[PDB]
Amino acid sequence: ADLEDNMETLNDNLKVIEKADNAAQVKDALTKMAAAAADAWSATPPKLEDKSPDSPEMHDFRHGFWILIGQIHDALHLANEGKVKEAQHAAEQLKCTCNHCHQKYR
Amino acid sequence: ADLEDNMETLNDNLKVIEKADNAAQVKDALTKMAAAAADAWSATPPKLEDKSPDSPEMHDFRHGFWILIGQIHDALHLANEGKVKEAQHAAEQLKCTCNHCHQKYR
Amino acid sequence: ADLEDNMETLNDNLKVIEKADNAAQVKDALTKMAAAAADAWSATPPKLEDKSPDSPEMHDFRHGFWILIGQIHDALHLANEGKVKEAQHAAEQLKCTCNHCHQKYR
Amino acid sequence: ADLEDNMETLNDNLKVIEKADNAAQVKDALTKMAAAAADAWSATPPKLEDKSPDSPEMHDFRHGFWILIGQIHDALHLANEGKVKEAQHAAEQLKCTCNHCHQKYR
C-alpha cells in the first residue's frame, strides 16, 4: 500500500490524462488512479497520527476519498463512451478535491 | 487483505446494523464495511483467478464495489444525522448490490 | 407532470428495459425515467399532503428521488457504454429504492 | 419552470452560504438550490435550441446537473450533521462545476 506511493500514482496519471491522445490512454490512467485511491482509504496520514480513527478529522479524511473515488468512477464512464474531452474536463475537476484535502491535511 | 475476510466483515456488520440500539453502533459498523469494501475493490475473485485483470468481468466486479462504497457513504451520513432508522433502511437496500454480484461470480 | 403519471412512466419503462433489444431502447427508456424522477422530486404524495413541505417525511421522501436519480444516471452510462445487460441489471436493482419508498409513503 | 428563475436562485443561495451563521441558514438555502437544479434538468437553454434534445451538448448540459445535484446532496448532509464549516467547503467545490458548464452556455 503506502500512502506516498498512492499519491505518486494519482499525480502521475492525472498529468497523462491532461496530455492524453485518445480514450484508451484515459481509461488506463483513471483505472490506476481508482486503485490507488481505494488503497489510500485506510492510510493514517502524518499530521493525524495522534488522533483516534473515530475522530472527525479521520472521518473527514476518509470522506475526501469517497468524493475522489466517486468522481473517478463517473469519469471512467465518460472515457468508456469515447468522450475524451469530457473525461479530460472531469479529470481536471478532481483538482478541486485534491487541493481541498492537501490544504488542511498535507 | 483476504477477500473472504472482507465479506465476513460486510456480512457480520450488516447484522450489527440490523439490531443496533443507537447511532454509535451503526456509525462504527458502517465505517468497518467501508474499509472492507475499499479493500475488496482491488481483489480478484476465485472464478476469475486465471482470467486477465482487464476483462469485462473484472470491470463489472470493480464497478460493483464502486456502487457498494457509494451506498455505504450515503448511509453513514444518515447515521451521522441521527437518522438511525433511515440508515438501517439504507443498509437493507445494499442487499440488491450484494446479490447482483453474487448471482454471477459467486 | 402529475406524480401518478411519473410513476406510470417509471413502471412502464422498467418493463421496456427488461425486454429491450438494443442500447438505444434502453437509453430512451432510462432518459424518460430520468425525467419522471426529476419531475416527481418536488411532488407531495397523498399520505403527506396535509404535512408541511419542510417536515422530515418530505426530506426523506425527496431524498428517495436523489438516490433513484443517481441510480438512473449511472445505468445510463452503462447503456452508453453498450453494456446493455448490465444496464438491465442496474434497472432491476432500482426496485430496492422503489419498494423502500412505497413501503411507507404509498 | 423558467430557466432564469431556477438559475438566479443558485447564485443567490450561494451568497447565503458564502457568509451564513449556522447549520440552519445553510440547510435551508441548499434545499432551495436542490429544487432549482431538479427543475432546470428538463429545461433547454437558448444557445442549443436548434440542436436536438439528443444533442451531445444537451447531454453535457444534463450531465452537468447530475453532478451539481449530487454535490448539493452531499453538502446538504454535512449541514444536517452540524458540520457547518465543511458544508461551506463542499459548497465552495460546487464552483468548479458552475463555471465549467458556464464555459459554453452562459
Ligand code: HEC
Ligand atoms: C485526502 C483526502 C487526500 C486526497 C483526496 C488527495 N490527497 Fe494527495 N496527499 C494527501 C496527504 C495526506 C498527503 C501527504 C502524504 C505524506 O505522507 O506526507 C498527500 C500527498 C500527495 C503528494 C505528495 C506530496 C509529498 O509531500 O510527498 C502528491 C503528489 C499528491 N498528494 C497528489 C494528489 C493528487 C494528484 C490527488 C488527486 C487527484 C490527491 N493527491 C488527492 C491527502 C490527499
Ligand code: HEC
Ligand atoms: C462483487 C462485486 C461483490 C459484492 C458487491 C459483494 N460481494 Fe459478497 N462475495 C463476492 C464473492 C465473489 C464472493 C465469493 C468469495 C469466495 O471466495 O467464496 C462473496 C462471498 C460473500 C460471502 C461468503 C463468505 C465466504 O465464506 O466467502 C458473504 C457472507 C458475502 N459475500 C456477503 C456480502 C455482503 C453482505 C455484501 C454487501 C452488503 C456483499 N457480499 C457484496 C462478491 C461480492
Ligand code: HEC
Ligand atoms: C418515493 C421516494 C418513491 C420512489 C423512489 C418510487 N415511488 Fe412509485 N410511488 C410513490 C408514491 C407516493 C406513489 C403513490 C402515488 C399516488 O398518488 O397514489 C407511487 C405509486 C407508484 C405506482 C402506482 C401504483 C398505485 O398504487 O397506484 C407505480 C406503478 C410506481 N409507483 C412505480 C414505481 C417504480 C417502478 C419505481 C422505481 C423504479 C418507483 N415507483 C419509485 C413513491 C415513490
Ligand code: HEC
Ligand atoms: C449547465 C450545466 C449549468 C450549470 C451546472 C450551472 N449553470 Fe448557471 N446558467 C446556465 C445557463 C445556460 C444559464 C443561462 C440561462 C438564461 O437563459 O439566462 C445560466 C444562468 C445563470 C445565472 C443567471 C445569470 C443572469 O441572467 O444574470 C446565474 C446567476 C447562474 N447561472 C448561476 C449558477 C450557479 C451559482 C451555479 C452553480 C452553483 C450554476 N449557475 C451552474 C448553465 C449552467
Ligand SMILES: [Zn+2]
Ligand atoms: Zn455521470
Ligand SMILES: [Zn+2]
Ligand atoms: Zn465539459
Ligand SMILES: [Zn+2]
Ligand atoms: Zn443522501
Ligand SMILES: [Zn+2]
Ligand atoms: Zn426509509
Ligand SMILES: [Zn+2]
Ligand atoms: Zn457506474
Ligand SMILES: [Zn+2]
Ligand atoms: Zn450484472
Ligand SMILES: [Zn+2]
Ligand atoms: Zn459525503
